[PDB]
Amino acid sequence: SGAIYVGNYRVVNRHLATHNDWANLVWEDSSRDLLVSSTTAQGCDTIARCDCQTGVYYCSSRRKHYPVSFSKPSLIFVEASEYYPARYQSHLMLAVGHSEPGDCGGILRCQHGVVGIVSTGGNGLVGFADVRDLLWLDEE
């Protein structure tokens, strides 16, 4: 689990978005596994505006941050895990790393701020849903 809090936005994995996320829906993309909902409290996270391919992600299944090299956001086919079926996903970045189902929502960050959140796992790979192209997160 985990979210990004920037301005009056909460960013979550679409598949973990709560009833309260959906009630206050701003934006969702089923092809990206992202959902943004409205918050009343002004958030403190900064979104990275960069093309870094290096950063640090939080892995709850190891209670550790790992430094990783990651691919540029792409359209990538995601294979079936234990709890979720397979499918395609856009704006997806892969790294060599540990990722289990409950790891979704762990933040990937570089010196410029938040890059993405954990979205996919399995086969010694971690997938991050990129948020750096959502410029609108940095006002109103």
Ligand SMILES: Oc1nnc(-c2ccccc2)o1
């Ligand atoms: O599956 C699901 N998650 N949230 C909702 C919801 C939220 C508000 C009103 C109706 C439904 O539905």
Ligand SMILES: [Zn+2]
């Ligand atoms: Zn960066």
